Amino acid sequence: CGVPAIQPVLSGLSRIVNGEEAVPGSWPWQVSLQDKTGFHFCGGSLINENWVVTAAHCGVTTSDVVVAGEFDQGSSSEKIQKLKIAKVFKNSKYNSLTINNDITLLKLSTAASFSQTVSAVCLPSASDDFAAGTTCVTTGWGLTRYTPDRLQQASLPLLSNTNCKKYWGTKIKDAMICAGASGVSSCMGDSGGPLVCKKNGAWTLVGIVSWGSSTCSTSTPGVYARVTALVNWVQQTLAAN
Amino acid sequence: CGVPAIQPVLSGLSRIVNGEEAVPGSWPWQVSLQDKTGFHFCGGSLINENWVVTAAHCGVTTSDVVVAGEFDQGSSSEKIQKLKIAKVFKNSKYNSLTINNDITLLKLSTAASFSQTVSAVCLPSASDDFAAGTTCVTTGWGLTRYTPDRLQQASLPLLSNTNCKKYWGTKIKDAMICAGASGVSSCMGDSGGPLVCKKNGAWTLVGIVSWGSSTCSTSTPGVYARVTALVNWVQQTLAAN
């Protein structure tokens, strides 16, 4: 997990404004969630051939579809896998008002076929420490909500929850983590999309997009479900299902 | 339906700022949705003894609870009914990105016991016309998100979708309707709460709260699921279940 067969290329432009275009296939766990009509509404991350992790506030159902291996949503020519969802596992502690514990697991009806462009992100262990100031990466097609059709990426620093409260106040709970406010927007991340940090040669899922600045401000951080706080529930769910 | 045993009293203060406190029990279809720990996160409306209608973006589950007959959330002394949810019916056309078709039905495990303070709102027929400019009423505890613990009410005018787009642009879809921007906030409405209009002596559910001004501005209208566009699905669901 966490080692793309196609290595990402992150330049200085990933750190400013709205980030930069990714190298195609270099974020191979990145998936798109589409409704039964093909409309992209959320992102997510493959954690193995049978399971995708996303945000609970995406409200995914078994009539939605996981699309893996995508780079350009406007291209009907690249190789992609449209994967049916067998069952949706929303974290029972999710609260649609506070948006806390904002994580859902999707079990696929048939396994994805892993390849150079389709593979899994690593999950952290519950006790992993991703320190404030660590440079992490968010990817997605989130800018299409407001424009490029190709997968974007941005490098942005993790904040401590205390400093994040300076921006978002009492909205910030223990099961959240913030990143950004460093001169780059967080808006390229789709709802439910990944925030990954590279530790020991492997990209690890540290956050899941929950919400960001309503104006995509470069000085307001994004807010993410804190995966370390929720990975024990992820593993219990996989083991029971 | 739509005829409270305790008649509402709406004064001029319902039309300005943040509205006014309701007469206790005068909105008897108003329910509160609480999580399994008792935390209020959404509103909804009884449409008969076995069914509550709310917003799909509330993400209600069968471990949440419908609370009927409530006036003061801070009082443990008034008579209320905590009703378990047997099954949740989310409209399959709901889109968590556009928030269109934002309606969910909750089937209760055991019927509510209707009374002076607990009874049903009327549903419109699909062809009903609620004209722009009509004064309607939104009720709820929505101000507690930002403060009074008792049920509030505001009188505010329906907008045409064309004029609503002046405020919300391409966010406004055919299955939405807007109300407000008349000098009063829409923020007293909980997510999933009622927007009712009185036609022919009966209060009828015209809207379900979807979202409003992020600053509760008195010059920005609230956006509601348009019940006339969704009542056919409501009746199909009741008839099939």
CSV table of C-alpha atoms in Angstrom, one decimal:
chain,number,residue,atom,x,y,z
A,1,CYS,CA,0.0,0.0,0.0
A,2,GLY,CA,0.9,3.7,-0.3
A,3,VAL,CA,3.6,3.1,-3.0
A,4,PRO,CA,2.3,4.3,-6.3
A,5,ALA,CA,3.7,2.4,-9.3
A,6,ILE,CA,3.7,5.8,-11.0
A,7,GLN,CA,5.5,8.2,-8.6
A,8,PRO,CA,3.8,11.5,-7.9
A,9,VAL,CA,5.6,14.7,-9.0
A,10,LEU,CA,4.9,17.6,-6.6
A,11,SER,CA,6.4,21.0,-7.5
A,12,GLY,CA,6.4,24.3,-5.8
A,13,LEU,CA,3.1,25.2,-7.5
A,14,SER,CA,1.4,22.5,-5.4
A,15,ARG,CA,2.0,24.8,-2.4
A,16,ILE,CA,0.2,27.9,-3.6
A,17,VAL,CA,-3.2,29.2,-4.9
A,18,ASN,CA,-5.2,26.1,-6.1
A,19,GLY,CA,-2.3,23.6,-6.3
A,20,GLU,CA,-1.4,21.9,-9.5
A,21,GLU,CA,-2.3,19.0,-11.9
A,22,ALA,CA,-1.2,15.5,-10.8
A,23,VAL,CA,0.8,13.1,-12.9
A,24,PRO,CA,-1.8,10.8,-14.4
A,25,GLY,CA,-2.2,7.6,-12.3
A,26,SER,CA,0.2,8.8,-9.6
A,27,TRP,CA,-2.5,8.7,-6.9
A,28,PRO,CA,-3.8,5.2,-7.6
A,29,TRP,CA,-6.1,4.9,-4.6
A,30,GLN,CA,-8.1,8.0,-5.6
A,31,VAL,CA,-11.6,7.1,-6.7
A,32,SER,CA,-14.6,9.1,-7.8
A,33,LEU,CA,-18.1,8.4,-6.5
A,34,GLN,CA,-20.8,8.9,-9.1
A,35,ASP,CA,-24.6,8.6,-8.8
A,36,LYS,CA,-26.5,6.1,-11.0
A,37,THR,CA,-26.6,8.7,-13.8
A,38,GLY,CA,-22.8,9.2,-13.8
A,39,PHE,CA,-22.6,12.5,-11.9
A,40,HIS,CA,-19.5,12.9,-9.7
A,41,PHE,CA,-20.4,14.0,-6.2
A,42,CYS,CA,-17.7,12.8,-3.9
A,43,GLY,CA,-14.2,11.3,-3.7
A,44,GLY,CA,-12.8,8.3,-1.7
A,45,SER,CA,-9.8,6.1,-1.3
A,46,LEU,CA,-9.2,2.4,-2.0
A,47,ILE,CA,-7.9,0.6,1.1
A,48,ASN,CA,-7.8,-2.8,-0.6
A,49,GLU,CA,-9.4,-4.5,-3.7
A,50,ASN,CA,-12.8,-4.8,-1.9
A,51,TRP,CA,-13.1,-1.6,0.2
A,52,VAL,CA,-13.3,2.2,-0.3
A,53,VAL,CA,-13.2,4.7,2.5
A,54,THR,CA,-15.0,8.1,2.2
A,55,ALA,CA,-16.9,10.7,4.3
A,56,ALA,CA,-20.2,9.8,5.9
A,57,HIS,CA,-21.7,13.2,4.9
A,58,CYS,CA,-21.4,12.0,1.2
A,59,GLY,CA,-24.5,9.9,2.0
A,60,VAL,CA,-23.4,7.1,-0.4
A,61,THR,CA,-25.9,4.4,-1.3
A,62,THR,CA,-25.7,1.0,-3.0
A,63,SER,CA,-27.0,2.6,-6.2
A,64,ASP,CA,-23.9,4.9,-6.4
A,65,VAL,CA,-20.8,3.7,-8.2
A,66,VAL,CA,-17.1,3.7,-7.4
A,67,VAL,CA,-14.9,4.8,-10.3
A,68,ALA,CA,-11.2,3.8,-10.0
A,69,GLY,CA,-8.2,4.5,-12.2
A,70,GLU,CA,-9.6,7.9,-13.4
A,71,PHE,CA,-7.5,10.9,-14.3
A,72,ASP,CA,-9.6,13.1,-16.6
A,73,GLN,CA,-13.3,13.1,-16.0
A,74,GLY,CA,-13.8,14.7,-19.4
A,75,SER,CA,-12.1,11.9,-21.2
A,76,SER,CA,-14.0,8.8,-22.3
A,77,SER,CA,-10.8,7.3,-23.6
A,78,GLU,CA,-8.7,6.4,-20.5
A,79,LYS,CA,-9.0,3.0,-18.8
A,80,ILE,CA,-11.2,3.1,-15.7
A,81,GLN,CA,-13.1,0.6,-13.6
A,82,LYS,CA,-16.7,1.2,-12.6
A,83,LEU,CA,-17.3,-0.8,-9.5
A,84,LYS,CA,-20.7,-1.5,-8.0
A,85,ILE,CA,-21.2,-1.1,-4.2
A,86,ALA,CA,-22.6,-4.1,-2.4
A,87,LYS,CA,-23.0,-2.5,1.1
A,88,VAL,CA,-22.5,0.9,2.8
A,89,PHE,CA,-21.1,1.0,6.4
A,90,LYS,CA,-21.7,4.4,7.9
A,91,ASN,CA,-20.0,5.0,11.2
A,92,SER,CA,-22.8,4.9,13.8
A,93,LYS,CA,-21.2,7.9,15.7
A,94,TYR,CA,-21.6,10.2,12.7
A,95,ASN,CA,-23.5,13.4,13.4
A,96,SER,CA,-24.9,15.3,10.4
A,97,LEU,CA,-25.0,18.5,12.4
A,98,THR,CA,-21.5,18.6,13.8
A,99,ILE,CA,-20.1,16.5,10.9
A,100,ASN,CA,-18.0,14.6,13.5
A,101,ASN,CA,-16.9,11.0,13.0
A,102,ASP,CA,-17.3,11.7,9.3
A,103,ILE,CA,-16.4,8.3,7.8
A,104,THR,CA,-18.1,5.6,5.7
A,105,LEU,CA,-16.8,2.4,4.3
A,106,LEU,CA,-18.0,1.0,1.0
A,107,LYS,CA,-17.8,-2.7,0.3
A,108,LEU,CA,-17.6,-3.4,-3.4
A,109,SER,CA,-19.7,-6.1,-5.1
A,110,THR,CA,-16.7,-7.3,-7.0
A,111,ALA,CA,-13.1,-6.6,-6.3
A,112,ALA,CA,-11.2,-3.9,-8.1
A,113,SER,CA,-8.4,-5.2,-10.3
A,114,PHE,CA,-5.3,-3.6,-8.9
A,115,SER,CA,-2.7,-2.3,-11.4
A,116,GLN,CA,-0.1,0.4,-11.9
A,117,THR,CA,-2.9,3.0,-11.8
A,118,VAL,CA,-5.2,1.3,-9.2
A,119,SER,CA,-3.9,0.3,-5.8
A,120,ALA,CA,-4.4,1.0,-2.1
A,121,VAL,CA,-3.4,3.8,0.3
A,122,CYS,CA,-2.0,2.8,3.6
A,123,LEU,CA,-4.1,3.2,6.7
A,124,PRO,CA,-2.4,4.6,9.9
A,125,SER,CA,-2.4,2.9,13.2
A,126,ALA,CA,-4.5,4.5,15.8
A,127,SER,CA,-1.4,5.6,17.7
A,128,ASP,CA,0.4,7.2,14.8
A,129,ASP,CA,1.5,10.8,15.3
A,130,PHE,CA,1.3,13.1,12.3
A,131,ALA,CA,2.7,16.3,13.8
A,132,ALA,CA,1.5,19.8,13.2
A,133,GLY,CA,3.6,21.4,10.4
A,134,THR,CA,3.9,18.1,8.5
A,135,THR,CA,3.5,18.7,4.8
A,136,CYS,CA,0.7,16.5,3.4
A,137,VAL,CA,-1.1,16.2,0.1
A,138,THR,CA,-4.8,16.5,-0.8
A,139,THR,CA,-6.0,15.3,-4.2
A,140,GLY,CA,-9.2,15.4,-6.0
A,141,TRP,CA,-11.5,17.0,-8.6
A,142,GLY,CA,-13.0,19.4,-6.0
A,143,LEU,CA,-12.3,22.5,-8.1
A,144,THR,CA,-14.9,21.3,-10.6
A,145,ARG,CA,-17.5,22.3,-7.9
A,146,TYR,CA,-16.7,26.0,-8.7
A,147,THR,CA,-11.9,24.9,-14.3
A,148,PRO,CA,-9.8,21.8,-14.7
A,149,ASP,CA,-11.3,18.3,-15.3
A,150,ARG,CA,-8.0,16.5,-14.5
A,151,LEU,CA,-7.0,15.4,-11.1
A,152,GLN,CA,-5.4,18.1,-9.0
A,153,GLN,CA,-3.1,18.0,-6.0
A,154,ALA,CA,-1.9,20.4,-3.3
A,155,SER,CA,0.7,20.3,-0.6
A,156,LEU,CA,-0.4,21.8,2.7
A,157,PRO,CA,0.6,21.6,6.3
A,158,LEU,CA,-1.2,19.9,9.1
A,159,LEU,CA,-2.4,22.2,11.9
A,160,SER,CA,-2.8,21.5,15.6
A,161,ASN,CA,-6.5,21.4,16.6
A,162,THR,CA,-5.8,24.4,18.9
A,163,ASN,CA,-4.6,26.5,16.0
A,164,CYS,CA,-7.4,25.2,13.8
A,165,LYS,CA,-9.9,26.5,16.3
A,166,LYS,CA,-8.6,30.0,15.6
A,167,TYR,CA,-10.3,29.6,12.2
A,168,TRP,CA,-13.2,27.3,12.9
A,169,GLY,CA,-13.9,27.7,16.7
A,170,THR,CA,-16.0,25.1,18.5
A,171,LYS,CA,-16.7,23.3,15.2
A,172,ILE,CA,-13.4,21.4,15.6
A,173,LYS,CA,-13.7,18.1,17.5
A,174,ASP,CA,-11.1,15.5,18.6
A,175,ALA,CA,-12.0,13.3,15.6
A,176,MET,CA,-11.1,16.1,13.2
A,177,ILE,CA,-7.8,17.4,11.8
A,178,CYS,CA,-7.1,20.5,9.8
A,179,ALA,CA,-4.6,21.3,7.0
A,180,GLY,CA,-3.8,24.4,4.9
A,181,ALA,CA,-4.0,28.1,5.5
A,182,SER,CA,-0.5,28.3,4.1
A,183,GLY,CA,-1.3,30.2,0.9
A,184,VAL,CA,-3.0,27.3,-0.9
A,185,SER,CA,-6.7,26.3,-1.0
A,186,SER,CA,-8.0,22.9,0.2
A,187,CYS,CA,-10.8,23.0,-2.4
A,188,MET,CA,-9.3,20.5,-4.8
A,189,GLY,CA,-10.3,17.8,-2.3
A,190,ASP,CA,-13.7,16.3,-3.1
A,191,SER,CA,-15.9,15.6,-0.1
A,192,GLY,CA,-14.6,12.3,1.2
A,193,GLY,CA,-11.3,12.7,-0.7
A,194,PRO,CA,-7.9,11.8,0.7
A,195,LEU,CA,-5.4,13.8,2.8
A,196,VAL,CA,-2.2,11.7,2.7
A,197,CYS,CA,1.2,12.0,4.4
A,198,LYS,CA,4.3,10.2,3.4
A,199,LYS,CA,6.0,8.4,6.3
A,200,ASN,CA,8.7,5.8,5.7
A,201,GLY,CA,8.3,5.7,1.9
A,202,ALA,CA,4.6,5.0,2.0
A,203,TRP,CA,1.6,7.4,1.6
A,204,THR,CA,-0.7,7.1,4.6
A,205,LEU,CA,-4.3,8.3,4.8
A,206,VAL,CA,-4.4,10.9,7.6
A,207,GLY,CA,-7.5,12.8,6.7
A,208,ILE,CA,-10.8,12.5,4.8
A,209,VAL,CA,-12.3,15.7,3.4
A,210,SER,CA,-15.1,17.0,5.6
A,211,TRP,CA,-15.5,20.7,4.7
A,212,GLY,CA,-13.4,23.7,3.8
A,213,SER,CA,-13.5,27.4,3.3
A,214,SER,CA,-16.8,28.4,1.6
A,215,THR,CA,-14.7,30.8,-0.6
A,216,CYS,CA,-11.7,28.5,-1.0
A,217,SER,CA,-9.6,31.0,0.8
A,218,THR,CA,-5.9,30.4,0.8
A,219,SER,CA,-5.8,31.5,4.5
A,220,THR,CA,-8.5,29.2,5.9
A,221,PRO,CA,-7.6,25.5,6.4
A,222,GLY,CA,-9.6,22.5,5.3
A,223,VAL,CA,-11.2,20.3,8.0
A,224,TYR,CA,-10.8,16.5,7.7
A,225,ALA,CA,-12.0,13.4,9.5
A,226,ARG,CA,-9.0,12.3,11.6
A,227,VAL,CA,-8.3,8.8,10.3
A,228,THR,CA,-6.2,7.8,13.4
A,229,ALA,CA,-9.3,8.4,15.5
A,230,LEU,CA,-11.4,6.2,13.2
A,231,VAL,CA,-9.1,3.5,11.9
A,232,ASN,CA,-10.0,1.1,14.8
A,233,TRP,CA,-13.6,1.2,13.6
A,234,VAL,CA,-12.4,0.7,10.0
A,235,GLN,CA,-10.5,-2.5,11.0
A,236,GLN,CA,-13.4,-3.8,13.1
A,237,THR,CA,-15.7,-3.3,10.1
A,238,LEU,CA,-13.4,-5.0,7.7
A,239,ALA,CA,-12.9,-7.9,10.1
A,240,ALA,CA,-16.7,-8.4,10.7
A,241,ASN,CA,-17.7,-8.2,7.1
B,1,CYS,CA,-54.3,17.5,9.3
B,2,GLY,CA,-53.0,21.1,9.3
B,3,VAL,CA,-55.4,22.3,12.0
B,4,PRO,CA,-53.6,22.6,15.3
B,5,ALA,CA,-55.8,22.1,18.4
B,6,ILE,CA,-53.8,24.9,19.9
B,7,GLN,CA,-53.9,27.8,17.3
B,8,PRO,CA,-50.7,29.5,16.5
B,9,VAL,CA,-50.3,33.2,17.4
B,10,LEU,CA,-48.1,35.0,14.8
B,11,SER,CA,-47.4,38.7,15.6
B,12,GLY,CA,-45.4,41.3,13.7
B,13,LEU,CA,-42.2,40.2,15.4
B,14,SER,CA,-42.4,37.0,13.5
B,15,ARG,CA,-41.6,39.0,10.4
B,16,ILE,CA,-38.3,40.6,11.5
B,17,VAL,CA,-34.8,39.7,12.8
B,18,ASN,CA,-35.0,36.1,14.1
B,19,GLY,CA,-38.7,35.7,14.4
B,20,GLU,CA,-40.4,35.0,17.7
B,21,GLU,CA,-41.3,32.3,20.2
B,22,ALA,CA,-44.2,30.0,19.3
B,23,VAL,CA,-47.2,29.3,21.5
B,24,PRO,CA,-46.4,26.0,23.1
B,25,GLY,CA,-47.9,23.1,21.2
B,26,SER,CA,-49.2,25.3,18.4
B,27,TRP,CA,-47.1,23.5,15.7
B,28,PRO,CA,-48.1,20.0,16.7
B,29,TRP,CA,-46.4,18.2,13.7
B,30,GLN,CA,-43.0,19.7,14.6
B,31,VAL,CA,-40.6,16.9,15.8
B,32,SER,CA,-37.0,16.9,16.8
B,33,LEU,CA,-34.6,14.2,15.6
B,34,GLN,CA,-32.1,13.2,18.2
B,35,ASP,CA,-29.2,10.8,18.0
B,36,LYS,CA,-29.0,7.7,20.3
B,37,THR,CA,-27.3,10.0,23.0
B,38,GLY,CA,-30.2,12.5,23.0
B,39,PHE,CA,-28.4,15.2,20.9
B,40,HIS,CA,-30.8,17.2,18.6
B,41,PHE,CA,-29.5,17.4,15.1
B,42,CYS,CA,-32.5,17.9,12.8
B,43,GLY,CA,-36.2,18.7,12.6
B,44,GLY,CA,-39.0,17.0,10.8
B,45,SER,CA,-42.8,16.9,10.4
B,46,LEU,CA,-45.3,14.3,11.2
B,47,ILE,CA,-47.6,13.4,8.3
B,48,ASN,CA,-49.5,10.7,10.1
B,49,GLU,CA,-49.1,8.6,13.3
B,50,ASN,CA,-46.6,6.3,11.6
B,51,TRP,CA,-44.5,8.6,9.3
B,52,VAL,CA,-42.2,11.7,9.6
B,53,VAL,CA,-40.8,13.6,6.7
B,54,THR,CA,-37.4,15.3,6.9
B,55,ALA,CA,-34.4,16.2,4.7
B,56,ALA,CA,-32.3,13.6,3.1
B,57,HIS,CA,-29.1,15.5,4.1
B,58,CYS,CA,-29.9,14.9,7.8
B,59,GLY,CA,-28.7,11.3,7.2
B,60,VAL,CA,-31.1,9.9,9.7
B,61,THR,CA,-30.6,6.2,10.7
B,62,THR,CA,-32.7,3.7,12.6
B,63,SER,CA,-30.7,4.4,15.7
B,64,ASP,CA,-31.9,8.0,15.7
B,65,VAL,CA,-35.1,8.9,17.6
B,66,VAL,CA,-38.1,11.1,16.7
B,67,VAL,CA,-39.2,13.3,19.6
B,68,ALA,CA,-42.8,14.6,19.3
B,69,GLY,CA,-44.8,17.1,21.4
B,70,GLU,CA,-41.7,19.1,22.4
B,71,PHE,CA,-41.7,22.8,23.1
B,72,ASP,CA,-38.7,23.5,25.4
B,73,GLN,CA,-35.6,21.3,24.8
B,74,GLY,CA,-34.2,22.5,28.1
B,75,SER,CA,-37.2,21.3,30.1
B,76,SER,CA,-37.4,17.7,31.3
B,77,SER,CA,-40.9,18.4,32.6
B,78,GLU,CA,-43.2,18.7,29.6
B,79,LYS,CA,-44.9,15.7,28.0
B,80,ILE,CA,-43.1,14.3,25.0
B,81,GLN,CA,-43.0,11.1,23.0
B,82,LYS,CA,-39.7,9.5,22.1
B,83,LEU,CA,-40.4,7.3,19.0
B,84,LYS,CA,-38.1,4.7,17.6
B,85,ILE,CA,-37.5,4.6,13.9
B,86,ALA,CA,-38.2,1.3,12.2
B,87,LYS,CA,-36.9,2.1,8.7
B,88,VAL,CA,-35.5,5.1,6.8
B,89,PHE,CA,-36.6,5.8,3.2
B,90,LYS,CA,-34.2,8.2,1.5
B,91,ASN,CA,-35.3,9.5,-1.9
B,92,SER,CA,-33.1,7.7,-4.4
B,93,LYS,CA,-32.7,10.9,-6.4
B,94,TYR,CA,-31.0,12.8,-3.6
B,95,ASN,CA,-27.6,14.2,-4.5
B,96,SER,CA,-25.3,15.1,-1.5
B,97,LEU,CA,-23.4,17.6,-3.6
B,98,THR,CA,-26.3,19.6,-5.1
B,99,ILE,CA,-28.6,18.8,-2.1
B,100,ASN,CA,-31.4,18.4,-4.6
B,101,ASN,CA,-34.4,16.1,-4.0
B,102,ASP,CA,-33.6,16.6,-0.3
B,103,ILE,CA,-36.3,14.5,1.3
B,104,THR,CA,-36.3,11.4,3.5
B,105,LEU,CA,-39.3,9.5,5.1
B,106,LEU,CA,-39.0,7.9,8.5
B,107,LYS,CA,-41.3,5.0,9.4
B,108,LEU,CA,-41.8,4.7,13.1
B,109,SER,CA,-41.6,1.4,14.9
B,110,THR,CA,-44.8,2.2,16.9
B,111,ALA,CA,-47.3,4.9,16.1
B,112,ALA,CA,-47.2,8.3,17.7
B,113,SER,CA,-50.3,8.9,19.9
B,114,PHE,CA,-51.9,12.0,18.4
B,115,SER,CA,-53.2,14.6,20.8
B,116,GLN,CA,-53.8,18.4,21.1
B,117,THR,CA,-50.0,18.9,20.9
B,118,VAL,CA,-49.1,16.0,18.5
B,119,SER,CA,-50.8,15.8,15.0
B,120,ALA,CA,-50.1,15.9,11.3
B,121,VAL,CA,-49.3,18.6,8.9
B,122,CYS,CA,-51.1,18.4,5.5
B,123,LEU,CA,-49.2,17.4,2.4
B,124,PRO,CA,-49.9,19.4,-0.8
B,125,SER,CA,-50.9,17.8,-4.0
B,126,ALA,CA,-48.3,17.8,-6.7
B,127,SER,CA,-50.2,20.4,-8.7
B,128,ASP,CA,-50.7,22.9,-5.9
B,129,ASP,CA,-49.6,26.4,-6.6
B,130,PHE,CA,-48.0,28.4,-3.8
B,131,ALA,CA,-47.4,31.7,-5.4
B,132,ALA,CA,-44.3,33.9,-4.9
B,133,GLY,CA,-45.1,36.5,-2.3
B,134,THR,CA,-47.2,34.1,-0.2
B,135,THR,CA,-46.4,34.5,3.5
B,136,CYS,CA,-45.4,31.2,5.0
B,137,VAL,CA,-44.0,30.1,8.3
B,138,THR,CA,-40.9,28.2,9.3
B,139,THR,CA,-40.5,26.8,12.8
B,140,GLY,CA,-37.8,25.1,14.6
B,141,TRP,CA,-35.0,25.2,17.2
B,142,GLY,CA,-32.4,26.1,14.5
B,143,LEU,CA,-31.2,29.2,16.4
B,144,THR,CA,-29.7,26.8,19.0
B,145,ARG,CA,-27.0,26.0,16.3
B,146,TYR,CA,-25.5,29.5,16.9
B,147,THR,CA,-30.0,31.6,22.5
B,148,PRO,CA,-33.5,30.4,23.0
B,149,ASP,CA,-34.3,26.7,23.8
B,150,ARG,CA,-38.0,27.1,23.1
B,151,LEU,CA,-39.6,26.6,19.7
B,152,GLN,CA,-39.3,29.6,17.4
B,153,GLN,CA,-41.3,30.7,14.4
B,154,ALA,CA,-40.9,33.2,11.6
B,155,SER,CA,-43.2,34.5,8.8
B,156,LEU,CA,-41.5,34.9,5.5
B,157,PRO,CA,-42.5,35.2,1.8
B,158,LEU,CA,-42.0,32.6,-0.8
B,159,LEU,CA,-39.7,33.6,-3.7
B,160,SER,CA,-39.9,32.6,-7.4
B,161,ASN,CA,-37.0,30.4,-8.3
B,162,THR,CA,-35.8,33.1,-10.7
B,163,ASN,CA,-35.5,35.7,-8.0
B,164,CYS,CA,-34.0,33.1,-5.7
B,165,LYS,CA,-31.2,32.6,-8.2
B,166,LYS,CA,-30.2,36.2,-7.7
B,167,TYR,CA,-29.0,35.1,-4.2
B,168,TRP,CA,-28.0,31.5,-4.8
B,169,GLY,CA,-27.3,31.2,-8.5
B,170,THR,CA,-27.1,27.8,-10.2
B,171,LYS,CA,-27.5,26.1,-6.8
B,172,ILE,CA,-31.3,26.4,-7.2
B,173,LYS,CA,-33.0,23.5,-8.9
B,174,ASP,CA,-36.6,22.8,-9.9
B,175,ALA,CA,-37.1,20.7,-6.8
B,176,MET,CA,-36.2,23.6,-4.5
B,177,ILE,CA,-38.1,26.6,-3.3
B,178,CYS,CA,-36.9,29.6,-1.4
B,179,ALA,CA,-38.4,31.9,1.2
B,180,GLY,CA,-37.2,34.9,3.2
B,181,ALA,CA,-34.9,37.8,2.4
B,182,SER,CA,-37.7,40.1,3.7
B,183,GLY,CA,-35.9,41.4,6.9
B,184,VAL,CA,-36.1,38.1,8.8
B,185,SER,CA,-33.7,35.1,9.0
B,186,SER,CA,-34.6,31.6,8.0
B,187,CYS,CA,-32.2,30.1,10.6
B,188,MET,CA,-34.8,29.1,13.2
B,189,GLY,CA,-35.6,26.2,10.9
B,190,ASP,CA,-33.7,23.1,11.7
B,191,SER,CA,-32.3,21.1,8.8
B,192,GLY,CA,-35.3,19.0,7.7
B,193,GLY,CA,-37.8,21.3,9.5
B,194,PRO,CA,-41.1,22.6,8.1
B,195,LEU,CA,-42.0,25.5,5.9
B,196,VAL,CA,-45.8,25.6,6.0
B,197,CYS,CA,-48.4,27.8,4.2
B,198,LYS,CA,-52.0,28.1,5.3
B,199,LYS,CA,-54.5,27.5,2.5
B,200,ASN,CA,-58.2,26.9,3.2
B,201,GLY,CA,-57.9,26.9,6.9
B,202,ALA,CA,-55.2,24.1,6.9
B,203,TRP,CA,-51.4,24.4,7.3
B,204,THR,CA,-49.7,22.6,4.4
B,205,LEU,CA,-46.1,21.5,4.1
B,206,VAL,CA,-44.6,23.5,1.2
B,207,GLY,CA,-40.9,23.2,2.0
B,208,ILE,CA,-38.4,21.2,4.0
B,209,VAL,CA,-35.3,23.1,5.2
B,210,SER,CA,-32.2,22.3,3.0
B,211,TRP,CA,-29.8,25.2,3.7
B,212,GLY,CA,-29.8,28.9,4.5
B,213,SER,CA,-27.5,31.9,4.8
B,214,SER,CA,-24.2,30.9,6.5
B,215,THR,CA,-24.5,34.2,8.5
B,216,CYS,CA,-28.3,34.0,9.1
B,217,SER,CA,-28.6,37.2,7.0
B,218,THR,CA,-32.0,38.9,7.0
B,219,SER,CA,-31.5,39.6,3.3
B,220,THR,CA,-30.6,36.1,2.1
B,221,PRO,CA,-33.5,33.6,1.7
B,222,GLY,CA,-33.6,30.1,2.9
B,223,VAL,CA,-33.6,27.2,0.4
B,224,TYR,CA,-36.1,24.3,0.9
B,225,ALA,CA,-36.9,21.1,-0.8
B,226,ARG,CA,-40.1,21.8,-2.8
B,227,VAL,CA,-42.7,19.4,-1.4
B,228,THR,CA,-45.0,19.6,-4.4
B,229,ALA,CA,-42.1,18.2,-6.5
B,230,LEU,CA,-41.6,15.3,-4.1
B,231,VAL,CA,-45.1,14.5,-2.7
B,232,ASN,CA,-45.8,11.9,-5.4
B,233,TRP,CA,-42.7,10.0,-4.1
B,234,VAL,CA,-44.0,10.4,-0.6
B,235,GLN,CA,-47.3,8.8,-1.4
B,236,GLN,CA,-45.8,6.0,-3.4
B,237,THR,CA,-43.5,5.3,-0.5
B,238,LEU,CA,-46.4,5.3,2.1
B,239,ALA,CA,-48.5,3.1,-0.2
B,240,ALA,CA,-45.7,0.5,-0.8
B,241,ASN,CA,-44.7,0.3,2.9
